[PDB]
Amino acid sequence: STLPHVAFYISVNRPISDEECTFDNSWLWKDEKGSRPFCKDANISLIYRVNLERSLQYGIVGSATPNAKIVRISLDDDSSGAGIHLNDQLSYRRFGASYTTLDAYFREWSTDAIAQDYRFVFKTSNNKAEILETFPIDNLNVKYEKRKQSGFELGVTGGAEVSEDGPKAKLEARASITQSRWLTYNTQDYRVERNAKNAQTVSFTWNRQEYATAESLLNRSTDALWVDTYPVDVNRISPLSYASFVPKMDVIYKASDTETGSTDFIIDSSVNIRPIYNGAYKHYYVVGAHQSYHGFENSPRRRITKSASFTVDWDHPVFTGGRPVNLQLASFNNRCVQVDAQSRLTANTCDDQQSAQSFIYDQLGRYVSASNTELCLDGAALDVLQTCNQNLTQRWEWRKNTDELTNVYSGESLGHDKQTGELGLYASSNDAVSLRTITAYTNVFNVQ
Amino acid sequence: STLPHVAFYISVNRPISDEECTFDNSWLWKDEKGSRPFCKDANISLIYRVNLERSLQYGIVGSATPNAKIVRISLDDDSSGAGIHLNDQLSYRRFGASYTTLDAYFREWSTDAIAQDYRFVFKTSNNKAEILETFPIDNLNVKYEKRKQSGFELGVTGGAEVSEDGPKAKLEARASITQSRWLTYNTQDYRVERNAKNAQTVSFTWNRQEYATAESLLNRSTDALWVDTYPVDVNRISPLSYASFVPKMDVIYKASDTETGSTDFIIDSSVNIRPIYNGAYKHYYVVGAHQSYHGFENSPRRRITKSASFTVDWDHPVFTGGRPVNLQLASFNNRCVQVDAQSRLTANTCDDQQSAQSFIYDQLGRYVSASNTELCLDGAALDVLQTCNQNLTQRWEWRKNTDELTNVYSGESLGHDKQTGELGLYASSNDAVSLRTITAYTNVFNVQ
Amino acid sequence: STLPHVAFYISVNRPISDEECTFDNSWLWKDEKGSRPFCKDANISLIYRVNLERSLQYGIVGSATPNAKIVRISLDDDSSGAGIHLNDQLSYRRFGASYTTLDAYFREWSTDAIAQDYRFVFKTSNNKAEILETFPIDNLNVKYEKRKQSGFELGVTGGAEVSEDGPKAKLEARASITQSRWLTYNTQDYRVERNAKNAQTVSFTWNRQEYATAESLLNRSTDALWVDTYPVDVNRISPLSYASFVPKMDVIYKASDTETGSTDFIIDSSVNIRPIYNGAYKHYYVVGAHQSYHGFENSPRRRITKSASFTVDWDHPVFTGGRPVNLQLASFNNRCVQVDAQSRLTANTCDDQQSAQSFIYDQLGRYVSASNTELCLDGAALDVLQTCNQNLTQRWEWRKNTDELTNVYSGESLGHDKQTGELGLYASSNDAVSLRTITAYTNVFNVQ
Amino acid sequence: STLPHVAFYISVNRPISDEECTFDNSWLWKDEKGSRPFCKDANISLIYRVNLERSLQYGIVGSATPNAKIVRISLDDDSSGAGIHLNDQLSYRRFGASYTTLDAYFREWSTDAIAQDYRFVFKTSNNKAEILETFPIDNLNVKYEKRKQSGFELGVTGGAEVSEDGPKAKLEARASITQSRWLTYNTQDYRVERNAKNAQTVSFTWNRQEYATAESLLNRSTDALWVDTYPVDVNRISPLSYASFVPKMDVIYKASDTETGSTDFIIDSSVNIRPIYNGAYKHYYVVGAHQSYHGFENSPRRRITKSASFTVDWDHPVFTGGRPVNLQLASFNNRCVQVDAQSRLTANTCDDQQSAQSFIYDQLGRYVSASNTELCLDGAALDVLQTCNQNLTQRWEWRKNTDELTNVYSGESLGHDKQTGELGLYASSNDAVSLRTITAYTNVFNVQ
Ligand SMILES: [Ca+2]
Ligand SMILES: [Ca+2]
Ligand SMILES: [Ca+2]
Ligand SMILES: [Ca+2]
Ligand SMILES: [K+]
Ligand SMILES: [K+]
Ligand SMILES: [K+]
Ligand SMILES: [K+]
């Protein structure tokens, strides 16, 4: 009775090799210090849930929901997978300049790679489907709190200084005017950015926001020359950026209710791997020589992607919105009514997953072919399916408490020849004709 | 009618011996001051709840949930156990340097061990199962509150100083410009870090965050030489660190609906035991000699683990999603239809937990073997189970208000020989054949 | 139909005698000033609610809840009792040193005792039961709010001083740099600390947190010598400390579904009674002599405990999960089927609370003994209970609208001899045999 | 079907006479200035709701609620009364010292009395009942917000002074270190303090908290001598202090399910009436003479109490938990079965409120005397009530669609002699015996 679905999981598993995230050990002296792997068993492991369905059940008229074929791709709390992993913990290596100098970089630290962003792109092979809705629904409309302060202050002062010179009196008056502005807003360390290039493609990117630059990771900005310590505050790097990331997003595609052909849906899951480079700069000043710490933002990044795809055939029986049944000729042990390519009807061995043996019993009482809902079983000519119309010969009702299917127009029962299974209309059975018809729901809702 | 489960508890009990958390009494003089136990009846006591189930009931088609075999491992409010325990209360010992000096560490305190972190690792013996979802769902996306302030201040001052010298007048003007930035965020003393190396393994770690270092536990940083007191603020160490810790987490594994074989699931519960070492450093300055307190972070830690495991056989009857019944031949006191290894049918003494005597009565009316859902009881050949298909001889219905099982194809009843229990189809009973069949639900949902 | 319970209250009443909380009048001069009672009709009055039950109803298979025997001990809003009481109000006594001095304590106040902590310990006599869950669920994971501020300030100043000496002009420039850190967190005056030593014992302690020391109760730290007043701010001592304390906690124990024997559960409710001692110290300085107030933390404390216990017999009928009935032989005025020690059946005068006359009517239709669910009433041999199996002679059904119990295998009715009550199977009653059986629910759910 | 209650209101009305709150006009000169009434038609008007009930309905076994007899005393939103009233508005009188002086109190104001506290004490005459639960559930566990701030500030200053003497340059450097602690918590002007001396008595006191002292009511602390004004800020005295106070509290007592005898419950409602005295102290100083305002805390207080009480008979029929019926012999116009003191049965004129004519029709079908649930109507001997047991002669069922009560054991109907109403068992009625029995619910749930 309820709306049928085609539901399946898509596993996206992609181990990231050691060479796939090997970067130069240093950014200032990239040609001298060699290279090393900045990850440790990096991996992508996601599980998408895909649903195919019609927007409404078969034959429902006057609904407030438009008729459409819906493809829903979801990565939610019920089905997410392990996630994207880069590192168990972050380490660093320190490198010094092989030659001494005066005003240049003399030290460098390279920290294990973090995820600059995670990107998930949903594409479509053709334009038969359009994005109907997504989750997250939209980019954030940031809320700001503004605050204006105005103040004044009035003061007086009376002093009395007594010394050998003589009494000395002071009188002072002060007036001050103050004005300040405040701005308050919220950030996160990863901000979701939704980017919809056109009706067929949308991408969700979780981008580093609060500490996005290597410079922002420094807990100290200046130091004395004798200080030689790691200047990065690793506590500012959340485990969300290397240990495990799981996105939450939904994409709903829709096609027109009369769409034909097929469409490939592609999901691109990627992580922008970014090693962190920091350098110490020697500033020689006559007053005092100090070192200043800097982060390099032009350092290399590598995007590691895994693509998953599935094909949707818009003529799949799930997009009729109905639950099909078969018509089994019960004089035989295993024979069902089957429709071939040119609409003719034959009796073949029943197959529960064969859509050519599936019919939808609609509201009018017609048996419409599940593979082509424009064709009906017509009692006037029971050798080929006929175009659905309002013919009374196309309407059937089940005789109560029996296995007889009767035609509405004439009241005759659907019978089949006991030798060949050829269908016909008969007032009553005889030696050569059986009136026993058995119907059961078929399972045509497997992804094929 | 509802979906069956296999549910059981796994107790993880591990007393931690005195030697398992014996550390050096001192960190600076580890070879001189001996060792002592830093715990007091440390213990791990957890109770995991495991559920085995199918994602859907047997034979349901067109659902929005994909077909899958689900393994759920839970440590929640309904079933958690005592928890992980290290100490009733924290004590300390003070040690002094055996030799006096000038600029070195001269005092040390070693505090009873706390839990640096609690780690729970969920592994899998092979890749037949993948992590589908977890709780906690993901690592935290930290929210920051930024605040920008800009201000200006204008002032004037008018002074009048009178003395023996003569009247003196002052006029002053001030202008100030201010700019400040605020950053606000929340921490905890234990932060959950989710780490999913691949599709088969996930680890949850509760890591000390707010006071993670021995240095952060010092309530004072400097003191005069004559001061000799414990410099650690024990109020900063919550009872969550040593008295009792109970995690809350769920892991859901999934296997394909056609998975075979078996899989071992391993749960590793561990605590990273960390003694706390602090030292007082003597700083001799000509202006003034003082002592500065330091915490040592390179001090030893010991991880104490307890592993629990259970085996899941993917061919368990619970993963069919149906509730099996037996077919008892009621002419005998105790005889049931039983399937042997090669599919033949015999009559044996009924066993309520024998899956070889269990059948699922499906929607079509077939009796499919619970141990192999591809085999049916077929009325055409009642000596071996046959492959499930759409044969009408494989469909059975119960005659109303009787103990007769009738075949759909021919209408004959299932009968058994009164001496050997051999099955057959009969229009009516006779002296040698009984038509009495009794069915009851079997209990095949025990973990075996 | 629903799950039966054994429910009862445990009253824990313990008046605390005057000598049980008599402490020394002074801490500095404990041998000179005598002793006094620091309480006023101190009392412990708690009411625990205990529930015994099975986790599931009898015979339920395939549930997501594991089979277990549950013991629930609760002290909640529905049943708590009066609480723990120490004082109606807090008073103090002042004591002075009998000898004058220069730099020593010269005054002391001893305040009426408060509760340093309230402790509730749940123990178990053996390891047949394990803690499954508690309330409070765990120790608190404290949440901290961190705040970083950075600022700069730029200023200019222009002064013009005019006097007899001549015009004088001033020009000044200021630059400031500021940095501050904030840490915010919540405390209570009593913090719950959960301490689970092992799988059998858990203790909950409400420990003073915000004002835990006598020093923290002083509203003033220094004073002039002539000042002679009580230096304790009694408003900082909440009525929760002495007037009435009621804990809220739950402990759920579980045993194996096949546990035998018995187990003693012990509840230890205690209060750590602590008198408050403060002293005034005379500090003689040439610049100025003052007095500083101090609190003494090494002052004595006394723990006053009351132990309650109850015994759980794991073979109690409540742990079957079923609601038993008796089988009354209705030809007699008062005769029921009774099982003796070795399984034989006799007719004895009915007792509604006798578990030897109680049977569970299970899903199969068997009458299993409530005192031993492995024994059934078997129609093949109606003189001794038989091991439960799938025998059809062990299944019974009630003939509709009558008082006849019929055997499933043969259809014969259960009858009893009209003189001795010996059971048997009969097609019909006669002069010596009655077929009238009456069944009613028995009350075996009293704590015994 | 549902659980019966005995419900009634207790009105506590106590007008407070003028002399009952007449205090001295002054505190410093109490013997000179006379006395006056500090209230204006002070009054106590409260309405308590009392419920008597059993914890469970009659005959319910296996419940998670223990069997108990419950007495509930409530003062809630549904039933509270007018409240406690002291004054329409607060006025004051000013008094001056009859003799002038130098350093002493020279003025005094006496303000109309406020309520220092409202106290409600629930007592019990004996220990048959214990406090099971209350509302408010417990004393408040105050929550504190702590805040630590640490900061540093660095500054430089460059000055250039130009005058006739010559150019003068200044260079300054500043460094500051700051540290602050914050503590935040909530108070009310009336705090509820629960005080449970033992299992039988609990008191609730609403005590003034925020402005509890006469000193805290002063809006000014010092003034010049010529100032002569009322120094009390009457806006700090809420109308809750004098105009109307209504408490909200519940007390639930429980007794053993087999308790006998009676118990008196006492409710003491009182208000601690407190006049407010303030004085002005003349401080003569050579620099300047001023007056300082003081409040006196040792001023008199008077507690005005009204006691209400009610008696609970633990053998009241409401504590059976069942709804009784009577057995009316319907051959008479007005005759019911009645039980006398020694258990004999007679026919007397029916009284709907007579518990001696009330029976509970229990689950077994027994007619249990409502005044003594250990006695049943037994068909073997219908002249005296018999001890309840499992006799089949003690079970009755109503013949359908008739007024006949039939015995379960023999099937005979309960009949009564048409002249005397003597009960008996008869197969059929005759001229001297009527089989017509009429039953109706009786109203035994009035407080008696
Ligand atoms: Ca509408
Ligand atoms: Ca849907
Ligand atoms: Ca489930
Ligand atoms: Ca329960
Ligand atoms: K602000
Ligand atoms: K701020
Ligand atoms: K702040
Ligand atoms: K603040």
Numbering used by the authors:
A (entry chain E), B (entry chain D), C (entry chain C), D (entry chain B): 133 to 580
Passage from the reporting paper:
Cryo-micrographs of VcαHL in SMALPs were acquired and analyzed for single-particle 3D reconstitution, resulting in a density map of 2.06 Å resolution. The map revealed a heptameric complex exhibiting C7 symmetry, featuring a β-barrel transmembrane pore channel. We thus attributed this extra-density to a calcium ion, coordinated with four water molecules, in line with the size of the density and the observed bond distance of 2.3–2.5 Å, typical features of a hydrated calcium ion. In addition, the cryo-EM map of the assembled VcαHL uncovers a distinctive feature within the pore channel—an unassigned extra density located between the side chains of R279 and W314.
Vibrio α-hemolysins (αHLs) are β-pore-forming toxins secreted by Vibrio pathogens, crucial for the facilitation of bacterial infections through host cell lysis. Using X-ray crystallography and cryo-electron microscopy, we decipher both the immature and assembled structures of VcαHL and elucidate the conformational changes corresponding to toxin assembly.
